[PDB]
PDB file of all heavy atoms in Angstrom:
ATOM      1  N   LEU E 731     109.062 100.182 -92.571  1.00 62.82           N
ATOM      2  CA  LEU E 731     108.316 100.440 -91.349  1.00 62.82           C
ATOM      3  C   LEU E 731     108.182  99.137 -90.581  1.00 62.82           C
ATOM      4  O   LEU E 731     107.495  98.220 -91.054  1.00 62.82           O
ATOM      5  CB  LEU E 731     106.942 101.018 -91.665  1.00 62.82           C
ATOM      6  CG  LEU E 731     106.996 102.223 -92.601  1.00 62.82           C
ATOM      7  CD1 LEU E 731     105.616 102.815 -92.782  1.00 62.82           C
ATOM      8  CD2 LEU E 731     107.968 103.276 -92.084  1.00 62.82           C
ATOM      9  N   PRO E 732     108.805  99.004 -89.419  1.00 63.22           N
ATOM     10  CA  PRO E 732     108.847  97.693 -88.759  1.00 63.22           C
ATOM     11  C   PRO E 732     107.479  97.204 -88.313  1.00 63.22           C
ATOM     12  O   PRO E 732     107.113  96.053 -88.575  1.00 63.22           O
ATOM     13  CB  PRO E 732     109.772  97.936 -87.558  1.00 63.22           C
ATOM     14  CG  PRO E 732     109.656  99.409 -87.289  1.00 63.22           C
ATOM     15  CD  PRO E 732     109.503 100.044 -88.637  1.00 63.22           C
ATOM     16  N   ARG E 733     106.715  98.076 -87.649  1.00 63.84           N
ATOM     17  CA  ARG E 733     105.487  97.641 -86.991  1.00 63.84           C
ATOM     18  C   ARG E 733     104.465  97.092 -87.980  1.00 63.84           C
ATOM     19  O   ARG E 733     103.678  96.208 -87.626  1.00 63.84           O
ATOM     20  CB  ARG E 733     104.875  98.802 -86.201  1.00 63.84           C
ATOM     21  CG  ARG E 733     105.363  98.905 -84.760  1.00 63.84           C
ATOM     22  CD  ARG E 733     105.037 100.262 -84.134  1.00 63.84           C
ATOM     23  NE  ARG E 733     103.737 100.273 -83.469  1.00 63.84           N
ATOM     24  CZ  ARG E 733     103.466  99.640 -82.335  1.00 63.84           C
ATOM     25  NH1 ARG E 733     104.388  98.938 -81.697  1.00 63.84           N
ATOM     26  NH2 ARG E 733     102.236  99.709 -81.832  1.00 63.84           N
ATOM     27  N   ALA E 734     104.460  97.593 -89.212  1.00 63.91           N
ATOM     28  CA  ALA E 734     103.437  97.209 -90.173  1.00 63.91           C
ATOM     29  C   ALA E 734     103.631  95.775 -90.655  1.00 63.91           C
ATOM     30  O   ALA E 734     104.752  95.265 -90.741  1.00 63.91           O
ATOM     31  CB  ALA E 734     103.447  98.162 -91.369  1.00 63.91           C
ATOM     32  N   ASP E 735     102.509  95.124 -90.976  1.00 63.75           N
ATOM     33  CA  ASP E 735     102.562  93.786 -91.558  1.00 63.75           C
ATOM     34  C   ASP E 735     103.448  93.767 -92.795  1.00 63.75           C
ATOM     35  O   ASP E 735     104.167  92.792 -93.046  1.00 63.75           O
ATOM     36  CB  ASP E 735     101.152  93.317 -91.906  1.00 63.75           C
ATOM     37  CG  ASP E 735     101.097  91.843 -92.238  1.00 63.75           C
ATOM     38  OD1 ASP E 735     102.167  91.196 -92.272  1.00 63.75           O
ATOM     39  OD2 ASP E 735      99.982  91.328 -92.457  1.00 63.75           O
ATOM     40  N   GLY E 736     103.401  94.827 -93.581  1.00 63.55           N
ATOM     41  CA  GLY E 736     104.319  94.988 -94.692  1.00 63.55           C
ATOM     42  C   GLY E 736     104.528  96.459 -94.953  1.00 63.55           C
ATOM     43  O   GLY E 736     103.625  97.279 -94.757  1.00 63.55           O
ATOM     44  N   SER E 737     105.733  96.798 -95.392  1.00 62.41           N
ATOM     45  CA  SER E 737     106.072  98.184 -95.668  1.00 62.41           C
ATOM     46  C   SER E 737     107.093  98.202 -96.792  1.00 62.41           C
ATOM     47  O   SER E 737     107.772  97.206 -97.056  1.00 62.41           O
ATOM     48  CB  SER E 737     106.592  98.889 -94.410  1.00 62.41           C
ATOM     49  OG  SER E 737     107.794  98.304 -93.944  1.00 62.41           O
ATOM     50  N   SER E 750     102.554 101.371 -96.404  1.00 61.78           N
ATOM     51  CA  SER E 750     102.267 100.419 -95.337  1.00 61.78           C
ATOM     52  C   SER E 750     101.094  99.537 -95.742  1.00 61.78           C
ATOM     53  O   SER E 750     100.028 100.052 -96.101  1.00 61.78           O
ATOM     54  CB  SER E 750     101.918 101.140 -94.034  1.00 61.78           C
ATOM     55  OG  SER E 750     100.507 101.171 -93.850  1.00 61.78           O
ATOM     56  N   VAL E 751     101.272  98.221 -95.657  1.00 59.54           N
ATOM     57  CA  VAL E 751     100.234  97.261 -96.012  1.00 59.54           C
ATOM     58  C   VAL E 751      99.880  96.478 -94.756  1.00 59.54           C
ATOM     59  O   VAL E 751     100.771  96.012 -94.036  1.00 59.54           O
ATOM     60  CB  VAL E 751     100.684  96.320 -97.145  1.00 59.54           C
ATOM     61  CG1 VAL E 751     102.066  95.767 -96.864  1.00 59.54           C
ATOM     62  CG2 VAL E 751      99.674  95.198 -97.361  1.00 59.54           C
ATOM     63  N   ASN E 752      98.586  96.341 -94.488  1.00 61.38           N
ATOM     64  CA  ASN E 752      98.105  95.649 -93.297  1.00 61.38           C
ATOM     65  C   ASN E 752      97.304  94.424 -93.713  1.00 61.38           C
ATOM     66  O   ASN E 752      96.429  94.512 -94.586  1.00 61.38           O
ATOM     67  CB  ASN E 752      97.281  96.589 -92.420  1.00 61.38           C
ATOM     68  CG  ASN E 752      98.134  97.272 -91.369  1.00 61.38           C
ATOM     69  OD1 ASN E 752      99.362  97.157 -91.391  1.00 61.38           O
ATOM     70  ND2 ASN E 752      97.499  97.988 -90.453  1.00 61.38           N
TER      71      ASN E 752
END
Side-chain angles (χ1 to χ4, degrees):
Chain E
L731 308 185
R733 270 164 90 71
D735 192 356
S737 63
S750 100
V751 47
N752 268 8

